[PDB]
Amino acid sequence: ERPTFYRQELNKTIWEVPERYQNLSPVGSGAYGSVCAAFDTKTGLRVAVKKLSRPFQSIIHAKRTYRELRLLKHMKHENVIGLLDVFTPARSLEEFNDVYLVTHLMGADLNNIVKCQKLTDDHVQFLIYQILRGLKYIHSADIIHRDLKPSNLAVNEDCELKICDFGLAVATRWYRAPEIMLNWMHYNQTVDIWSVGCIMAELLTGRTLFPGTDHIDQLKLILRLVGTPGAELLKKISSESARNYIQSLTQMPKMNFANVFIGANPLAVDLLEKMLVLDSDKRITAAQALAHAYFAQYHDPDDEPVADPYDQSFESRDLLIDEWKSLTYDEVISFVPPP
Ligand SMILES: CCCCCCCCO[C@@H]1O[C@H](CO)[C@@H](O)[C@H](O)[C@H]1O
Numbered sequence: 001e002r003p004t005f006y007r008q009e010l011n012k013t014i015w016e017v018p019e020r021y022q023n024l025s026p027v028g029s030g031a032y033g034s035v036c037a038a039f040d041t042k043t044g045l046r047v048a049v050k051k052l053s054r055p056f057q058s059i060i061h062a063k064r065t066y067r068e069l070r071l072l073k074h075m076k077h078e079n080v081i082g083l084l085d086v087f088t089p090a091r092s093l094e095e096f097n098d099v100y101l102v103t104h105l106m107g108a109d110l111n112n113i114v115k116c117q118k119l120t121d122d123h124v125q126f127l128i129y130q131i132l133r134g135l136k137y138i139h140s141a142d143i144i145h146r147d148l149k150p151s152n153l154a155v156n157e158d159c160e161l162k163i164c165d166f167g168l169a170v171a172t173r174w175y176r177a178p179e180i181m182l183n184w185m186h187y188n189q190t191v192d193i194w195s196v197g198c199i200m201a202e203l204l205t206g207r208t209l210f211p212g213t214d215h216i217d218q219l220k221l222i223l224r225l226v227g228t229p230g231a232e233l234l235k236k237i238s239s240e241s242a243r244n245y246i247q248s249l250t251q252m253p254k255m256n257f258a259n260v261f262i263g264a265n266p267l268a269v270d271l272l273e274k275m276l277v278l279d280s281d282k283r284i285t286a287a288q289a290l291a292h293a294y295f296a297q298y299h300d301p302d303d304e305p306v307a308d309p310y311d312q313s314f315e316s317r318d319l320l321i322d323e324w325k326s327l328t329y330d331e332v333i334s335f336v337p338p339p
Pocket residue numbers: 178179182184186187188219229233236246278279280281
């Protein structure tokens with residue numbers, strides 16, 4: 001039943017992994033934990049193996065460990081990072097102290113693609129299509145990503161793409177929706193559509209759309225493009241101080257995006273106009289965007305699947321270290337690899 005493990009001292013720690021994984025080599029350390037590239041001798045795939053850092057050091061670490069494992073076990077979609085394997089060298093709950101995750105090693109991210117390469121329109125369509133397809137799936141599980149940016153988009157050779165998080169793929173601020181920088185505290189899923197808009201603009205032009213030096217500059221750059229809030233939007237702002245400030249602003253009109261994205265496909269410009277709207281209620285959804293004529297060559301309504309509902313009820317629970325550890329052990333033990 002149980003595999004044979006082998007011991008190895010790497011970044012600065014012991015790696016104990018099943019002997020099916022060969023030729024470990026470090027590719028990234030820090031707040032994620034710690035990650036090695038490896039060859040999965042069973043499947044002939046290159047994989048990434050992540051050893052979680054200090055997984056059960058405190059209540060908060062332990063709950064984070066649980067959260068990450070639960071999320072990754074749920075995602076079963078071609079355009080979202082998934083779990084190939086999860087294991088521990090421990091034989092029982094009493095000795096359970098280390099957790100390793102195994103995912104595909106896609107060989108790069110969209111940062112590396114963006115300015116080593118000037119993208120054709122067909123290839124922009126393909127990249128954004130795959131983002132939106134993965135996002136439809138994530139949103140259907142009632143999950144919001146909140147941090148979509150090029151370094152969270154893994155890409156291989158053929159520019160097949162997966163949405164990532166937890167380090168498994170310069171400034172994050174550049175892709176954030178305005179309402180996050182205003183500390184809104186209720187978010188629509190379409191915060192993620194704003195970020196897609198920013199990413200798409202950049203694939204088209206080869207430049208960051210809103211390269212703010214800080215959150216205030218970032219907002220200034222955004223308003224110059226989309227204009228200052230209209231009355232219809234102002235009706236939905238409950239914060240007195242935010243209304244006051246916005247009202248102090250000298251009004252500016254929406255720019256016509258055709259004048260900004262010069263020479264882009266007219267359909268891409270249209271789609272951009274529908275993503276980069278200040279009012280989150282009026283942004284196109286991932287589902288609706290898939291059907292936009294810009295993606296006519298890739299869209300198939302019968303092959304854009306949705307997710308099973310994801311039980312987030314644990315986020316509201318306050319438990320002990322050993323309880324979060326036990327729940328995590330349960331999830332390791334119940335793991336079933338994909339085909
Ligand atoms: C500088 C002005 C920035 C205004 C940002 C406007 C965000 C508008 O989007 C708002 O998002 C909220 C939360 O997702 C929703 O509850 C509101 O109904 C919606 O209007």
